[PDB]
Structure formats: C-alpha cells, structure tokens
Amino acid sequence: METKEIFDAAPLSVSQFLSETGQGLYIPPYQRAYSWELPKIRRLLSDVAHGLDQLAEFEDSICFLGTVIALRDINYTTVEPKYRSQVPSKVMTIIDGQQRMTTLLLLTTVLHEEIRVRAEKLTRDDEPSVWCYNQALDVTGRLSNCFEEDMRYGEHRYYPRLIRSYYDVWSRNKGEARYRSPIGYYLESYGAYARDPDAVKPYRHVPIDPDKTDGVDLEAYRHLDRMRDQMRSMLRKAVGAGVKREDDIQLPTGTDIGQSQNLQFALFNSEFPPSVVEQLEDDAKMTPLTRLIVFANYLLHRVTVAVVTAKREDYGFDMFEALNTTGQPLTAIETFKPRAIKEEGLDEWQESESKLHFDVVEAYLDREGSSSADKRQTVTSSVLLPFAMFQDGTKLTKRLNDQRRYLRTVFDKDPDIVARRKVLAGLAQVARFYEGPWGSPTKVPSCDDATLRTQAGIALAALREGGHDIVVGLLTRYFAAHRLSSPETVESSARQFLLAARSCAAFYALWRGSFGSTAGIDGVYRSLMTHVVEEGMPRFARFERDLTEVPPVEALQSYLKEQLRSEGIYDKQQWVARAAMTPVYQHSKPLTRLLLLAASQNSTPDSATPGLVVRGKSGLLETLELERWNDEAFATIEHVAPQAPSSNGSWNADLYEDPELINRIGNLTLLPAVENASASNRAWHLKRLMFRALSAATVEEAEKTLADAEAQGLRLGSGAGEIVRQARYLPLVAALAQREEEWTAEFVEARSQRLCSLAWDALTPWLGFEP
Amino acid sequence: METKEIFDAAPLSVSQFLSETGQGLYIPPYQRAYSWELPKIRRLLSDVAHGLDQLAEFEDSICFLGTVIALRDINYTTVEPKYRSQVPSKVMTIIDGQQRMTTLLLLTTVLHEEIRVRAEKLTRDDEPSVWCYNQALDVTGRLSNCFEEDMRYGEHRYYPRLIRSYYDVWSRNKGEARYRSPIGYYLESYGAYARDPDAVKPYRHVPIDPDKTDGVDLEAYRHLDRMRDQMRSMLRKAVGAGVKREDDIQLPTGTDIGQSQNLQFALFNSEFPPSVVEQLEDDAKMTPLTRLIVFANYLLHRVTVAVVTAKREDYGFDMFEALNTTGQPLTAIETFKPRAIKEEGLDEWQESESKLHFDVVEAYLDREGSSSADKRQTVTSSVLLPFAMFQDGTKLTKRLNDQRRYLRTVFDKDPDIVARRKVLAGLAQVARFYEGPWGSPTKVPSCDDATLRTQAGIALAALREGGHDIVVGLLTRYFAAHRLSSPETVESSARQFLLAARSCAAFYALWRGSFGSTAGIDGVYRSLMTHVVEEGMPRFARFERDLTEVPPVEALQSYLKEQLRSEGIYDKQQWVARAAMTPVYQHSKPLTRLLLLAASQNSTPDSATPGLVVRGKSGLLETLELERWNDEAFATIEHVAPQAPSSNGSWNADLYEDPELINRIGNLTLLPAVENASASNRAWHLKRLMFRALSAATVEEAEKTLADAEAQGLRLGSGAGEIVRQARYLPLVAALAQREEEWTAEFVEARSQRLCSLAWDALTPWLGFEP
Amino acid sequence: METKEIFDAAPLSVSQFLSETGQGLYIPPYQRAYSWELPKIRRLLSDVAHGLDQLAEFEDSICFLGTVIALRDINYTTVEPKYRSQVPSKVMTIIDGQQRMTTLLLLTTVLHEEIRVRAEKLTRDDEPSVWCYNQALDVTGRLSNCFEEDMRYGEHRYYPRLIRSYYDVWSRNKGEARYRSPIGYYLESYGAYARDPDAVKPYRHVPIDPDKTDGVDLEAY
C-alpha cells in the first residue's frame, strides 16, 4: 500500500475510449442532468476544429479534451437498477466529466447522420465519388460502434453508452431494458434510426414520453434534444454556404485538405488518390461530405481525453478534489519570454534591445491586468490580437496554445536579431499605442493642423467605444512610424497616422451604417493587411520588412473605397438607401452618435420642411471634434417615438408595424441633460414641448417655454432637471420643435433619409472620395 | 501516434517522488518565484496531519496532495545554464506544482531539523529510548536523501533538488556550481548544516548575498526563509507546550499513537515494542519526538502526489490547460442521497418518509445556496456541522470526505429504517430551524407568556449576530419538540424552547463577558450533548432515541450552571471582577449590545454618584425584547473617551496607559441617531454636551441645549442629522450628562463595574440562578 | 480477473534492478544451491563484453541478460525465518533466475574490488588521473549500493541483497541477524570489506565455519 494502484491515468483518443468493445459508460445517480449551454458546446467543437485546422501545418499536433475521472466498477455495485444476468463486462461509472462525455456521444451522433445522408446523395460511378462513398462507410461504421454496441441477442439488441442510474437499465432482453434518461433515450432512438433499412432520410427524432417517464424534468429532455440538434446545425453550416459568419466553425477546405499530405496521412494512413485532390481543389459537390469525414476522423483518432480510473469510489472523490485544485496558468507572453531570453544573445540581457521591448509589454500587462488572473489573460489577449494583424495579417485566437504557438512561429521566421528584435518591437509598439490614443484619445500625435488632431481624435474615441478592435492592427502599424522616423519626417508621419485614423472611423461608420452588422469588415481589414500593394514595394501590415517603412498614407483609402464598391456600395444614393433602413440604435449606440454628430455638422433647421435639417454654414458649430463627442451638452440618444408604448400613450401605430422603425436615425437626436431619469419624455406633444424648451434664442422665450411645458408637467420627477436658464445650440432639436402635423412613419422615413445623407456628405471626404 | 506517449501519469508517495536516486527537480524560467502565503502552507500541513489522524481509524485511508506536471527533459534542453558533464541523469522540469514541491522540500527540511535535535536530547540507555533514537535515525536519513542527493566526488559533492533556471547550476566541480535561488540556496545551506559534525544546535540560517546575487528581489529570499521558519514553528508548537490555539495542527499524542495498531503497522511495518507504547501513554520526555517521527513517516509514505510526465513541453502546457477544466465537485449531501434512496425501501420512493426530509433539506439548500457553487457547499456546511451536534454530538469538520463519512456512519448505525429515516428527520429539522427563529427571529414559536416571545427573540437575534453557532444543535434539538408534540403539550414544548434560547444567550453573555474568547464554550456545549443525564432516561443531544422525547426544559440551566463554576467563576463578585477588565467592544460588538441592553433593564440615572445608574422600576422601560434589539432608537455603540485622539483632542491619557481601557463597558453606551457619520463627537465637553442633548425631558430643554451645543457646534458635518425635537428615553445617557468633574480612568473603572453588576443581575435569572 | 495482474513484466538495467532503494532479493527455500560451472560464467561475461564492444559501433545496441521471475511477496509469507520488525520493505522471492542473480551480485563485487584497489594506486595529481579517480568513486559507489543496502542503524546496519531462506535472516539488530548461506555470507563479508577504511589491499576472504553452519553442504561454499 503506497502506489497500491490508487489511481490510474492513461490518454485515449475518443475512438479508443468510447468504442472499447466491452464497456459501458455509466452516469452515477448523484450527477446533475445535462447542463452545458450552447457556448460551452461551440467552444468544444471549435477546439477540435482548430486542432484539425492546425494539423495540416504541424503533423504531430494532438488536441486535448480534458479529463474524465471514473470508477472502474468491478462488482457492478453502482449500477443501481441492474440485471446482473447481462450487465456489460467493464462499467466505468463517470465521477467527473460526464458533461463532456454526453456532449461527445451526441457529437458522434450528428457526425454520423450528416456523413451517412450526404453520402447516399453520392454518384457511385465516378471513381473519386466511390472513394468518398467508401471512406464515408468506413467512418459511419466506426462511429456507429462508438456510441452503441452490438450485444448479440434479443430485442433491444444494441446497448447505448452513457446511461445514468435509475432511468435506464442495460439489458438486451425484451422486458427489463429501459432507455429513458435524456442521453439514454437519445442514444437508443438514434441508434434504432441508423439501422433503418431503406433509410437515408435525415434524422427526425421523436422526443420521448409517449405517456410516462416523469422521472426527469421534461425540460431536461428539451435541453438535451435542442443541444444535439444545434450541434447538427453548426456542422451543417460549417461546410455549406458562404455567409460564413464570424464565429461558426471553420474546418479546412477541399483545397486545404487535398493539398496537405500530412493531414491525409495522419487521418487516413495513406495519401489520397490524385483524382480526389483534383475533385476537391474546387468543391464539386462532394467536398462538403469529404470535409465532414476529415473532421470525423480527426475527432476519432486525434482528439484525446485523459482517463483516470480509480478502483475505490472514496479514493475517486478525493481524486476529483485533488484535481479541482491545480494552479493558475501562464499567459502566452510569460511562456514565450524564455525564448527571447535565449536569443539575446545568451543570458547577458538587461541592457539589450529585447529587454526594453519586454519591459514595455510587461509594464502594460502588470498595469491593466494585475487585478486577477484571467483578467491578466484577457489583457494579454487584448495586446496580442492587434499584434497578429500588425506583424503578419492573421486572426489570432483567444486560446492559449495558439498564442504560444504563433509567438513561437513569428519569432522563429527571420532567425536573426535586429530581425527578431523587430518582431518584439512590434508588441512593444501595440502596447504603446494602447497607452496614448486609446487611454485618453486627446494625445493622438502632435502635428499642427489642429482640426486634424481633434478630428482623428473623435475617430479614436468612437472606435474605442463600440467594438471595432480589428483596426488596432493598422493604426498601431502607423502610430509606429510616427515614433520611428528620421527627426524630419515627424510631421509626415503624424499626418499619415491621423488620416488613417479618420478613414478607419469613416469606413466603420459606413460599413456598420449600411449593413446591419460587422459582417465581413474584420475579414476585409485582414485581406487589406495581406493583399499585394504596388507590385513589390511594401506589404500592407508590416511583414518582415522594417516597421518604420510601409505602406503609404492613403492606399488605405483607395482600397477601402474599391471595396466599398463590390458588396459595399458607395454612391450616396445607394449608401443612404441602405442606411435609412437599418436600425442603428439596435446596433451600436456609439455608431448612432457618430452618425448624428456627422449629420449635424454646422447644421441648421430647415424652413421648407418642418423637422428636417440642412447644411451650408462651413463652420457654424462643427461637430466632428473629439471635444464634442464627450460634450455632455448634448449627449443622450433620445428616441422621438419611444420604444415602449405598452398601452399606447397615444402615438401613431404606423411606426410600429415594423419594429425597426423606432430605431433608425430618423427617430433619434442628441438631447442634453436628461435621458429617462431626471425629467423626461412622454407622447408626441410633450415631446414637441420638451424639444421646444431647448431651442429658444432668448431668455424671454426660455422661461416662457419652460412655463409653457410645465402646464402639462415638464417638471417631471421633481422640478425639471438642470432646467432653468440653459443656452446651447442643437440644430436637430430646433428643427423638431418646428414640426406640428404629427409624428408619421413616413416622416421618420424621410428624416432618417435626410440625416444619413448629411452624414455621408460630412464624412466621405475622410476617405478622400472620388471613386 | 494515438497515445504515442503524449503523457504518462503515476502516483507516488512524496518519498518515492522526491528521493529517487538520479532525479533533479528543475523550476523552468517562466515560473513565478515562491508565492504561497502562510494560510496555504498551514492548510497543507493540516491536510497531511488530518490524513494521519484518519489513518488511525481507517488503516487504508491514503492522503492525497494533488498533481505535479513535469516535462521529462530528456536532452537537457531546458536546463538553461548547464554543465552537461554532470547535469543529473534525470531532470524533470516542473511546469505545474513547483509551489507545492517547494513547500514540501522545505517541510522535510524542518522535520529533519526538529527530529535531529530532539533526538539528541534522548537518554540513550533505556530500551524505549534506544528504539526511539534508532527510529529517529531512520526517518532522519530518509528525509536527508529526500531533499539533497549524494553525487559522489568534488566540492559541492551534494546536489539539491528544486533548482530554478538561470540562477543555480547543478554540478560537483569547484567553480561552476551555483545554488542562488531562494529554494536552491535554502536547500544547499540547510544540507550543509545537516552534514555538520559536532553540531546539534538547531538550524540558524545565514540568508544569502554576502555581497551579491541580485538577479532576484531580495524579498523572495525573505518570504521563503520566513515561510520555512514558520513551518518549523508550527510543528514545534503542535507537539510541544499546551497553549493549543484554535488552528494549530492536530496530530495524535503518544497514547493515541501507542494504542492504534494500524498506525504502527502502516508507518513502521510492525507493532511497537510494548515498552514503547507504555512510555508513550504519558509523554515522558520522548513523546514529542515520537509524534514528530510518526508525522514525518506519514508524510513520507502515505502522502501521495499524482505525477504527470510529458515528453514535449507544449504537450505539457496543453495538458495543464486540460486539467484546469475539471468539473465542480458536489456537496456531501448530494453524494449521500443515493444511500438513502436505497433504503426506502427500494426504488419505490416518492411517497416515502425520507423523500420528505430530503425535499426539505434540498429546498433549503437550493434557496440559500444556488448563488454560486462553493457557496452551495458553504451552505451545506452551515447545515451539516450543527446536525452533527444534534444527532450525535461531534465536531464535524468543514472538509468533504469528513462530511460524507460522518453521514454514512450516522445513517448506517441502527440499520433498520425509522431508525435511519429518523436520522434524516434530523437534517430536515436543522434546516427548518434555520427557517424559523434564525431567519427573522420574530417568528419564534407560538405560546402566550408574550414576554418570553420577545425575550427569547432577543436571545436568538443576539446569538445569530456575533458568532456562537455552537448552540444551533441544542436549540434545533428543542425546536423539534415544539413541532412534534401530542397536541396538548404544544405549549409545554414552545416554552421549553423559548427558555433554552434565553439560557443560551445568558451563558453566552456571561462566558464571553468574563473570559476573553470562545475558549471552552464549544467544548462545553459538546460536552452537554454527549454526557449521560439521569441514568437511563434520555441523552441530551438526540442519540438515536425518538426525536419528540428528550431532554427536559432546564437541565440545561443546571448543567451550564455547574459548569459556570469550575473555570467559569459565577459569584457576582468574581464575575464582575473578570468582566470589568475585558474590552468587550474588542470582541464581539453584539456581545456589548447584549450587555448594555441587559445593564439598562428598566434602569435610571444615579444621583448618588453622577453618571452611574441603578435599577428598581420592575417595568419602567424594559429592554430585553427583540423589538428592542433592532430598536434603532438606542442602537449605536458610542465610546465616551474616543479611540481616536492622536494629538489629544484634549482628553485624559490615564485612559491610554492601558489600551484595553477605552473599550470596556464603562466607556460605551447605546446612542441613537448618529455614530460618526451625520453629526458626532469631539473632546470631553462637546461629548458632555451631546449626552446632555439627548436626555432632555422637555422641548424647552431640547431646543435650549441643542443651541447650547451648536455654540461649540453640535451641527457637525452639515446641520446635526436627525436632531430637532426628539422624545426618547436612554437612561444611560442621562447619567452621563450628569457627571461634571472629568472623565477619569478611575471613574471608567467604577462605571464598568456598576454596569457589569447590573447586567449580571439582569441576566443570571435567565439561567434560573440558584447555583 | 482476466489480466487482473496475473503477471507483470518490465525491463531494468542491472543498476536499476539491483539497487532499488527499498528492495530485498530472497531465494525461496526450494531452489538448488549455487551450481553454475565456470563456463556459464564465462559466457555471461563474454556476452556483456560483446554488447559493450558492439556499443561503440551502434549507439543504441542494448545487451540482454534473460529473465528473472519473482513473486512480490507483499505480506512476507515466504521469508521463512523473519523479523517483521524490520524485514525489508519490498522482498522479491526469485522463482526463476537466482543463478544469474547470484552470478551478477558476485560480479558487481569483483568489479568493485578491482576498480577500488586499482584506483588507490592512482597518483591523484595529473588531471586525467584525477578524472579517473573520481570516475572510480562514482562507479565504485554505484556498485556498492548495488550489492548491499544501508538500512540505517544498528550493528549489521547493512543488508545484503539475495539471501536464501532458512539460513540468513535480514535484520539490523545485534542478535537475530544471520547471513550463513553461501551468497549471503559472501555478500555480507564483501560488504564489510568494502567499508573497511584504511584497507585498500585486494580482497582476501575468510570463509565461514569458524565452527558452524552445517545447515548446508560446505561444498557449495
């Protein structure tokens, strides 16, 4: 008694784990039911998909799936409703991890359904098509004996795996066999489905309780069934169309597969028939099935769970405990520092370039992290992704091994120094960018042009608030050249950077103004960072090369525009067309602020149409100034027509047949002081009056109209907020106090039209428009 | 490539892990330096000491210590400054666990020190003495080759384990060998001390840097050296004197050891010679050493860590990642539910006694737990420790295996059912007690006697605030009888319960008033729960028996009283002597609230001496009513002489010779309105004025003295908080407005003495005092 | 129960096999005495030397020595005259192979003798020479803790490995520890000579029976 077995860990691929010929996986009776919300599931599938995608590159890369701790129950003392007559030969009651295992078996069930049914749609007279049909049969059977097992006689001839105590008893006989737990029932039913002769229709699923089985929640069944069916949807979509939304699950493509020898060997122990790398090089109807199968094989033979087997249950619980207490992992920077300590040059580093860069990055990390441990990792991810765009042009993930591996890769391309310490200079500079223009945007750079300073400054303060980090790459790329330049070209730099900032915010405003979402834009900037620019001179996001150089000032503008063509559209007519019909408040509130502030650039109330606005005062009160973003003068996005009229305070239901009406430009302005807290709002009249309050050009109308509105009750909440003698000029609220008639739906349409047009005119000079 | 090594897991006793003959433990260069604060170290030692204590019971209980994940560096690619000539043959660079491992090596160093020097004090002419001296030699050597290792020639002929990269190079040659990290240096130097002939003094230690080695923080050395010497002090105290503070580290005593066969086999492969168990039964100069030796051998051979070995570093990182994702363990209650499902009777439970109890306990858990996952286990602990009092009379520990084991033990004593399902009825009642008089005390039970209701109600609200849960056993024990009673003896029960509550508040008030701490009280309440009371009639804390019956109503009082003798002291004289000299504001503030509210029970300002108080108005305004605990009339503890007078607001330093003065009753009362937030305090005059303010028996003293004090300034902070026209009667504050002279230390003694006298008078009737 | 241990095999260098820090090798009481005529010994050395010579060429060339089958006697039921007080912590009763094992232990004893006494002939002042002396110390010790093991106190503080039942009781105490079987006594006596300070004379060897130990044959000795 010292190691007297105690515990017993070994690694297994999920195929060698699940499909062991005589085993039953058994959920002990104190486990909760299936929890795992769909984000945990998506992380799961995306993990294995990532490891697969990275397998083409690194031929030995193994993907991990955690631990399962189980009791090897040898006298079947834990199968609480059992028929010893024929319990399986090795039961492994799952002490911990049963959530993963449930997810896993389900994953196989959907991989099985998809690969089967797409494979019957195959033309078996095409040589590569039959190759694919055969490969499919292979993986189909190999998953089939992964989730269920052919015990050899009786009705209920097939045993699931996973089972739960109480509901579900393993047996192969005609009475006495139940499969009634969520996973128990699910696997029983799918299994019988697969064995349908003359099947080949996709899987329905007939969810349980024909009149019984209230041993669980019925909500549990709902959850498990839904979770499975969404695994099926995720995968279906991961090979299908091209809408390719930002997360989804990216596994390599037909061309990817066909041209990766190592992927072929490590998943099919053989090199592909050349007829097939041909058929795959260009989708050709069979590439989705083949991609699903490659994913299948990677799942089976290259994803591994760590299996810990205890022989006594009490040891097993103490094991679980000892494994829930296992340290505090290290950010990819910490684990990467050794690899530059060991190139600079030896261990004599302290006053040797890289030390300074690392002093920078570590300083920033200790500052903004510190507070916790995964705060420290999310800060590290924050400074690492812009860098990945910057130094390379690749989308870095938030997963540790990737960050570690990418830093290792990039650092080990140009194997010098002066060459490598430029790579580290990259990270240093992204940190430095976070310290200047993003902390408080007013630093920006120096430069004169003092309208440029606060214009690019509003660009920054808006790009911070509301997502659009994708940009931190490029802009750091340029903030770099301003601080790396011959003492003369300080001004040249400062200008390129400032203009770049403006144009990025502009393109932001247009892309998210027109579409309803950040659809491609992340990918578009990625493509920008890699695309060839001007024959052989630079490459957009510094790429080896030399950090100081590259690209110009303005190849941004021409490329972003040339893109605004394509599936972007850039004629003010086409663009304001898209943007007048997109609910901007639903999207990012800082975008709608940018749009209102750009639409009311030195603007004035319109006399021809009561409530619109127009331009023409070159510099009346110019709003695209960073000082007028923060301007808590007018800094509340107020809806004219409210979002909530639950019993209808009155209003016009023309505005609510389409629930997006209430959230377009034409329904909002920037109102000072109160939001919905001090003194605010009501129905279209009290709203008229409130706007009439703040728009008067004399105090002998200010107090007059304060009193005008106090009759119906403008002093709402107590006695009207900071509402006694406010000056201030708000062109949109002035020309909104000037409309009587009523608040029509047509009028919000025309208003959002007019507002978008003004903004477009105000901004598109920021991309330097002529395309 | 499928399990292609990847990883490789094995359990080893810390002896077989550390003292393997060719191994080097190597801390790679991205590890933090030695972190672990003393709470963690003390937890560690307690874990192993617990394992020992529980090995005495269960001869098989193995104690776990978690995981260390290490890279078997096979070509020494991570020994970052190296002399390959004699790198040790097997280095294991530690990815995770270097904190535990560092602690462990330090621990061996301290046990080696203690056992060394304590065995030199042995009279080696005595047969059990020579056994102990040898046994000491045995573990002494097995620890020695546990922390260092004998490479065989040269200066620096001895290698550490644990070494840190960058600083520290293993080698045996005369230049060229460094051990300069915190752990490296510690191990090197301690080893030299151990190998000193003609030594035998305890280890001093000469911390590092004779003028160098500033690659580190100089604080790291401080922290590590300190943690070592306090491991040493911790043990020294756990086997030495008798002060036995609340934590300490509980390891068995000579007798414990001497009479437990299984402990002797499992640590010494053999039964002790009886001469030794005899000399052990009563310390006799050799028992501390033996206790320490038993502890060290348990450390060496029965603490076992799981060692996970990877062959590539990045595999090790991904593993570490995969073992940080390891479920969320379950409360001892969840893992015990099955074992009562399978006694009721079989699986046809749903309408079966035990189901009801569990539904109750589960409801209460899901209600108050829920919010987190370890909050759920902390809720379960809150209901489990008192249940341990109630159904048995044992101190349950807050550790999981202990809770599970106790539940299995108790549930399976009287192995019928009805005996068992009564045991479960126990848990249900603890939860319901937590739902009745502890949530809001105001429910209490029913009954008339309506003074008992708010009197036991203040008893409860007082026992809840300010620790003293030790009672929850008893009272639940009683609350049961009120809900389980022949409908006639409902009133008898309700009364018993209320009186139990009062008596406990009394014994509390006295015990923490007179003594300085919860010194014995815990043992006292447990003692009552186990003692035989009246031969064969019952037993105080339900012990099987039958839930409704048992004990009386008032044997509580007699027993608690008989105990108030001994080391309790209860002659009003003795008690006031003790309690006048205990700073009660220092201990539990609710205790001082209880003592002041009992000291002003229908009390009146004293005229004979200006500022004390006297009783006698039987029902003037009686304060021991739960409606007056919360009565934020008088619910602020005001110090007369302030704790803060750093430059002397003026005041009297007679009160500051002894810092316990400022915090005795004689310096505190119950003040309405302000503490130190609205309008408050100053120097003793303004304090006079504030006490004169709220004591006014007319409004024409209210406004008069309000403005009196605004002259010096009672409106401090704004304009005197809720201070205009207050009725309100606070007898204590009147006789505080009634002392002129000055605020002396002598008078504070007098004041606390009288207040204590009064409270003693007011409360001891709650124990129905005759002893 | 299908492979439920049944058996359990693994390879070990003669170093990691013999010198396990807590092990005792025990010849059960039905084994024949030491037989092996000098030719089997000659093949033993010639094989190990051949593997050695073939290592210069192939850096992976590993040399085998056969199999030993042992029972991991866990509650000391085959140690036939025992002091449980301090039987070694892990005994392995050798079901097959005790002839190799006896040869081996003897071999380690002779290599230890030669390397020791030749190294004391070293002029420890010549740089390669001190290289050699140290190397001697390293191998010398790693053979010492190969044939015996330092249990830590008492007279007869050192245990042989290999011991034969009936004759020979492992213990570290002053009565009660016997080593009178042929190997037992040889290893014990070699061990004592190893630890003689100020020896450094080659080994003589003073064989048994000052008047006793005819529990065996005397020819085996």
Residue numbers in the entry:
A (entry chain A), B (entry chain D): 1 to 771
C (entry chain C): 1 to 221
Article excerpt on this structure:
In the PT-based defense system Ssp, SspABCD confers a single-stranded PT modification of host DNA in the 5′-CPSCA-3′ motif and SspE impedes phage propagation. Notably, SspABCD coupled with SspE confers resistance to a wide array of phages through unusual mechanisms: (1) SspE is a dual-function protein that exerts both N-terminal NTPase and C-terminal DNA nicking nuclease activities to defend against phage infection, and (2) NTPase activity, including GTPase, CTPase, and UTPase activity, is stimulated exclusively by 5′-CPSCA-3′-containing DNA in vitro. Here, structural and biochemical analyses reveal that SspE is preferentially recruited to PT sites mediated by the joint action of its N-terminal domain (NTD) hydrophobic cavity and C-terminal domain (CTD) DNA binding region. PT recognition enlarges the GTP-binding pocket, thereby increasing GTP hydrolysis activity, which subsequently triggers a conformational switch of SspE from a closed to an open state.
The full-length SspE structure revealed a smaller NTD (residues 1 to 324) and a larger CTD (residues 332 to 771), which were connected by a short linker of only seven residues T325TGQPLT331. The NTD of SspE exhibited a DUF262-fold with the strongly conserved D96GQQR100 signature motif, which was essential for GTP hydrolysis and was positioned at the junction of the α3 helix and the β4 strand. The CTD of SspE contains a DUF1524 domain that belongs to the His-Asn-His (HNH, the last histidine of which can be replaced by an asparagine, as observed in SspE) nuclease superfamily and indeed exerts DNA nickase activity in vitro. In contrast to the typical HNH motif in Cas9, GVE2, ScoMcrA16, ColE7, or BrxU18 that consists of two antiparallel β-sheets and an α-helix, the HNH motif in the CTD of SspE from S. yokosukanensis DSM 40224 was composed of two antiparallel β-sheets and a loop, suggesting comparatively higher flexibility. However, the active sites of the HNH motif in SspE still adopt a characteristic ββα-metal topology, in which the first histidine typically acts as the general base in the DNA cleavage reaction, asparagine is involved in structural stabilization and the third residue, which can be either histidine or asparagine, is responsible for metal binding. Indeed, single-point substitution of N676 in the HNH motif by an alanine or the elimination of divalent metal cations, i.e., Mg2+, markedly impaired the DNA nicking activity of SspE in vitro. One unique hydrophobic patch that was also lined with positively charged residues, e.g., R32, was located on the surface of the N-terminal region of the SspE structure. SspE displayed an extended dumbbell-like shape, with a short loop linking its two globular NTD and CTD domains. The NTD and CTD packed loosely against each other, with few contacts between them.
